[PDB]
Structure 1
Amino acid sequence: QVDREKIYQWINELSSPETRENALLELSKKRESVPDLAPMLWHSFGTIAALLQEIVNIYPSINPPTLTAHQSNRVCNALALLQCVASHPETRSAFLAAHIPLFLYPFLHTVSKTRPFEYLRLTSLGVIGALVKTDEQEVINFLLTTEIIPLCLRIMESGSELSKTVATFILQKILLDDTGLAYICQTYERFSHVAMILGKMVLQLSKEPSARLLKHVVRCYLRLSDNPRAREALRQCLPDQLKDTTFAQVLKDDTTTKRWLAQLVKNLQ
């Protein structure tokens, strides 16, 4: 029980600012050899409060953007532990009920392209990504009423390849939900704004291949074509790069994306 007593001490060391930075570092490294880490974090005294504290304490560094690598590494260790809590079946619902993702949205709103901020956005995205991976509909309901879709769309347009991929994955999960699809296609303005961004991404992908990103972009289009109004609009504004041989090379390895693409073209008839 020597390794596990080492986990308990670190958890207990998160409460005091004196010992927290080191505890954050060590715990974040062990979160995939300790299956029950999330409920121990959630249900211990003051632990989640300490992680929120870590988050809010870098708010003065967001605007003007002065966040350093050291600050970013530290809060990202805290974000790594919240991702762990977001993923676990036993803590996901309580995490959502406490509206903890709202304290991440200021990070997602940043636009600075320095490495400390890109890492901050990617890691924050990873928390939301862990939430929607579990495919609960309570999660999509929460996201829809908290306006994370514009946050994701801005990132899909302007972020690093990694951030664009996580952000598009979140959009994909929202769209796959019946409620999410209806929300995004409720007005032409909403639909159009999403279609426009996806269109820009396809152009970018044709210049700079990213198999993972292309896969999610294609999925999003395919799901959008399930909506009749969106289907008709897509018959007009679907990028020519998705109809011709542009991606034929990079796709002959990806059978799943090819099948999705062919389903998409098929649908638009």
Structure 2
Amino acid sequence: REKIYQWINELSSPETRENALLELSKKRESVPDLAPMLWHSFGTIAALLQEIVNIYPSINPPTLTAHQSNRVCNALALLQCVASHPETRSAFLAAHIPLFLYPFLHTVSKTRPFEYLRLTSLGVIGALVKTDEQEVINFLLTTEIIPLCLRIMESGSELSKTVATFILQKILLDDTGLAYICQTYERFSHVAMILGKMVLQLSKEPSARLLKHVVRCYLRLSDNPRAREALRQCLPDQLKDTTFAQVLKDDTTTKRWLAQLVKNLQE
């Protein structure tokens, strides 16, 4: 508790806010109640959003430096902290704070500063949907986060693609999210096409976590009657062959899922 209070308090005057963001960002894992402390502290959340908003112009044209990205990501780590705490989770959603991260998620630059910015931003969202609250899914649906996730799964770093897919997975898990993605052949096909190319490169450049999420997504889509029908024709061969046999020999969960997916298709 020692320095935690002082640092939190120091997040005020921009003269000592940088050190506080850093010191706090690292001690986060420890202090289990940091989230409510951050949230309930006067002007602290605003200070964090201030950090986010300050770099909006450097995001496009893409001139964000490593230093800018690191400091803002410190703030984002504290927001992720606030996003997954049971006592602050729901209010975090009321504040529509995730809407402050979307411009970050829209960037496409490849430099590490941007990739780190996007990965950390995705971490906040992933922690938001970790508990399946109906309201968070409906929030993400209506704010158009899906297309942002799709592009990233489609051309981001392996790390970022994993979290983006996990987010799409959570959205798909809920009945509303599943029905929304399958409402038109075009929206389903867009998602299926992306998961498709993911299943092709993953077969030559393996990735356990990513492969696990891609399988869950496909499995979940097989719950919708029309997507199931479509998948009867468009489910990539690599998911039916034995191509993933070896790598799955250790991940019993995902293997069980792929078996269920193949079972669901056809009749």
Task: Give the TM-score normalised by structure 1.
Answer: 0.98
CA–CA separation in structure 1 for the residues paired with 2:171 and 2:212:
16
Which deviations, in whole Å up to 9, do the C-alpha atoms of 1:226-250 show, x marking residues without a partner? 0001100000100011010111111
Q: Report the counterpart of residue 227 of structure 1 in structure 2.
A: 224
Which deviations, in whole Å up to 9, do the C-alpha atoms of 1:10-39 show, x marking residues without a partner? 111101111100000000111111011001
Which deviations, in whole Å up to 9, do the C-alpha atoms of 1:47-88 show, x marking residues without a partner? 000000000000010111011111111000000000000000
How far 1:5 sits from its partner (Å)?
A: 3.3
Runs of 4 or more off by more than 4 Å in structure 1?
A: none
The two structures, once aligned, show a CA RMSD in angstroms of 0.6
Q: Report the counterpart of residue 153 of structure 2 in structure 1.
A: 156
Which deviations, in whole Å up to 9, do the C-alpha atoms of 1:72-106 show, x marking residues without a partner? 11000000000000000111111100100000000
CA–CA separation in structure 2 for the residues paired with 1:175 and 1:68:
35
How far 1:134 sits from its partner (Å)?
A: 1.7
CA–CA separation in structure 1 for the residues paired with 2:127 and 2:55:
22
The answer to whether structure 1 residue 134 and structure 2 residue 131 are counterparts is yes
Q: Report the counterpart of residue 59 of structure 2 in structure 1.
A: 62
How far 1:136 sits from its partner (Å)?
A: 1.1
Aligned residue for 1:253, secondary structure, equals: coil
CA–CA separation in structure 1 for the residues paired with 2:175 and 2:132:
12
How far 1:184 sits from its partner (Å)?
A: 0.4
Which deviations, in whole Å up to 9, do the C-alpha atoms of 1:142-165 show, x marking residues without a partner? 001000000000000101110000
CA–CA separation in structure 1 for the residues paired with 2:4 and 2:250:
43
How far 1:207 sits from its partner (Å)?
A: 1.3
Aligned residue for 2:108, secondary structure, equals: coil
CA–CA separation in structure 1 for the residues paired with 2:53 and 2:204:
39
Aligned residue for 1:17, secondary structure, equals: coil
CA–CA separation in structure 2 for the residues paired with 1:177 and 1:108:
23
Which deviations, in whole Å up to 9, do the C-alpha atoms of 1:201-235 show, x marking residues without a partner? 00110110001100100000000000001100000
Aligned residue for 2:63, secondary structure, equals: coil
Residue segments in structure 2 that go unaligned for 5+ positions in a row: none
How far 1:137 sits from its partner (Å)?
A: 1.1
CA–CA separation in structure 2 for the residues paired with 1:141 and 1:60:
29
CA–CA separation in structure 1 for the residues paired with 2:230 and 2:258:
17
Q: Report the counterpart of residue 68 of structure 2 in structure 1.
A: 71
Q: Report the counterpart of residue 234 of structure 2 in structure 1.
A: 237
Residue segments in structure 1 that go unaligned for 5+ positions in a row: none
Which deviations, in whole Å up to 9, do the C-alpha atoms of 1:99-140 show, x marking residues without a partner? 000000000000000000000000000000000012211110
CA–CA separation in structure 2 for the residues paired with 1:179 and 1:185:
10
Which deviations, in whole Å up to 9, do the C-alpha atoms of 1:155-190 show, x marking residues without a partner? 001011100000000000000001100010111111
CA–CA separation in structure 1 for the residues paired with 2:85 and 2:256:
32
CA–CA separation in structure 2 for the residues paired with 1:136 and 1:63:
33
CA–CA separation in structure 2 for the residues paired with 1:32 and 1:114:
28
CA–CA separation in structure 2 for the residues paired with 1:33 and 1:19:
22
CA–CA separation in structure 2 for the residues paired with 1:83 and 1:244:
39
Give the count of matched residue pairs. Answer: 266
CA–CA separation in structure 2 for the residues paired with 1:48 and 1:253:
43
CA–CA separation in structure 1 for the residues paired with 2:76 and 2:213:
24
Task: Give the TM-score normalised by structure 2.
Answer: 0.99
